[PDB]
Amino acid sequence: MNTPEHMTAVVQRYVAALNAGDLDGIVALFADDATVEEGGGGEPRSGTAAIREFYANSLKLPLAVELTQEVRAVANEAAFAFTVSFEYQGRKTVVAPIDHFRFNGAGKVVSMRALFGEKNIHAGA
């Protein structure tokens, strides 16, 4: 049993932890044998240490992360639309993915799949 309220709060913990650059808090959301994958990126990575590494790379720059719509949560799944903004060498980029989490009866995330393509990356020259 997962509630929609629980899964929504887990998405919001996730978004806030990227904002905070809190890797322990991001990884604590996941089950021990979870996997993470980004749609057009490399193969899925599985289990606690791999998941940690995946996110450490995401965080080399401070990130401004925000949900851009209400979370969709039902049954044991949640999907959400959001943006990740960051600065580098004087240019602001805003990336807008949609991510999908699947939960276990424990309420932990067993899989996260993120989807964004080159059209979802908004940045001046």
Q: Which residues are annotated as a binding site?
A: 99
Among 46, 72, 93, 108, indicate the residue that binds its own copies (CB under 8 A): 72
- Shortest separation between residue 38's beta carbon and its own copies, angstroms: 9
Which long-range CB contacts under 8 A does 48-51 form with residues at least 24 apart? 51/27
Residue 94 CB, shortest distance to its own copies, in Å, is 11
Could you list the residues known to form a binding site for substrate, using ranges.
99
DSSP class per residue in 65-119: EEE-S--EEETTEEEEEEEEEEEETTEEEEE--EEEEEE-TTS-EEEEEEE--GG
Query: Looking at the annotation, which residues are catalytic?
Result: 14
The footprint of its own copies (CB under 8 A) covers: 4, 8, 39-40, 68-75, 77-81, 96-98, 100, 115-120
